[PDB]
């Protein structure tokens, strides 16, 4: 259905241990496809998914250039932000940015993104209009004023409405066999007695892509949101994801509980019960 | 491809 391209930039200062490290990773949906690391022996934009490997040297050279330039810009920016917050030269700090575009099934721009954080806190973001900024504090207002004066929002809008969506559409075609394939979860319910009158029912989902999934437990048809333990969806390492949901139930009452599974790769939602 | 970003 809908898709996204997103780049994730992390720059971290490390006083006494060289210049700040810059890492950029690119994703289409839940699939990483490139990386760049300023600490690499020979920093280069590198492929991380098979379908991107066909791009020619111009792609790799241009993206490498952009990332080397960005490395320096983020270093200058970290120096600036330290000043905006009256911070000493002794501490380590982090500047993060995530940017990119979302498209619908027809490939048209749904919306664009350009958001930044400093030391894990929201700093500045491009608004959905792709024309104005939201600054989190008086420090970010300095960046906002600079970016307004230089019409940076206009640059982002041009990139997001052009380059970004054009490349996303290209990636989606080149990687269609995986990027446009939803793999349904393999599911089962396990049962583990806790004591003489309580047992855990755990509903498993394995091998699914993309990561978006809904796993719920119902008791007599009512959602057990408060009583359900849901682990974070986790990567298996083969592109797929895993998740479980568990509920503690009175012994003998197991049949009043059903696990419901919703996922894009399923022909229809699943309703599972424990099978003794 | 990526964007060449501006200084904060």
């Amino acid at each position: 259905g809908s898709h996204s391209m997103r780049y994730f930039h992390t720059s971290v200062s490390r006083p006494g241990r060289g210049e700040p490290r810059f890492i950029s990773v690119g994703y289409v949906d839940g699939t990483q496809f490139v990386r760049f690391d300023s600490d690499a022996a020979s920093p280069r934009t590198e492929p991380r998914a098979p379908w991107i490997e066909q791009e020619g040297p111009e792609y790799w050279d241009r993206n490498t250039q952009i990332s080397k330039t960005n490395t320096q810009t983020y270093r200058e920016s970290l120096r600036n932000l330290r000043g905006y917050y009256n911070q000493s030269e002794a501490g380590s700090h982090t500047l993060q940015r995530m940017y990119g575009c979302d498209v619908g099934p027809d490939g048209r721009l749904l919306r664009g993104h350009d958001q930044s954080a400093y030391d894990g806190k929201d700093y500045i973001a491009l608004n959905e209009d792709l024309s104005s900024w939201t600054a989190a504090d008086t420090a970010a207002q300095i960046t906002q004023r600079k970016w307004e004066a230089a019409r940076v929002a206009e640059q982002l809008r041009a990139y997001l409405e052009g380059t970004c969506v054009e490349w996303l559409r290209r990636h989606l075609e080149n990687g269609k066999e995986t990027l446009q394939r939803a793999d349904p979860p393999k599911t089962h319910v396990t049962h583990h007695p806790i004591s003489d009158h309580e047992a855990t029912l755990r509903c498993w989902a394995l091998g699914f892509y993309p990561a978006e999934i809904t796993l719920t437990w119902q008791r007599d048809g009512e959602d057990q949101t408060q009583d359900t333990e849901l682990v974070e969806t986790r990567p298996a390492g083969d592109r797929t994801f895993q998740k479980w949901a568990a509920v503690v139930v009175p012994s003998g009452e197991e049949q009043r509980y059903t696990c419901h599974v919703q996922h894009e790769g399923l022909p229809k939602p699943l309703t599972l019960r424990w099978e003794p | 491809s990526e964007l060449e970003i501006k200084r904060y």
Partner: protein
């Protein structure tokens, strides 16, 4: 303001004794990004463990997958040891094939 890592230890495929698999340690929800992760076999550090490229979630917190080939047996114990600035001492989480 810092955030302590969540930690899950698990296998890529359903575990079957004698059969080669991958052992995963997924650390997530942490900030700042510097983190130390070891995979352990019977209390000893496994050599040449690989990991994913650093990325982060919508809430800005970081995540990494550390992984290595392994062949689970009935007797061998596996675990993940994590240190982070938020932790007074390294946290050890044992692999449970039912989790």
């Amino acid at each position: 303001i810092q955030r302590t890592p969540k930690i899950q230890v698990y296998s890529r495929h359903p575990a079957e004794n004698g059969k080669s698999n991958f052992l995963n340690c997924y650390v997530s929800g942490f900030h700042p990004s510097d983190i130390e992760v070891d995979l352990l076999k019977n209390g000893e550090r496994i050599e040449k463990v690989e990991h994913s490229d650093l990325s982060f979630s919508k809430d800005w917190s970081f995540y990494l997958l550390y992984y290595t080939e392994f062949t689970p047996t009935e007797k061998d114990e596996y675990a993940c040891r994590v240190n982070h600035v938020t932790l007074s001492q390294p946290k050890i989480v044992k692999w449970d094939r039912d989790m």
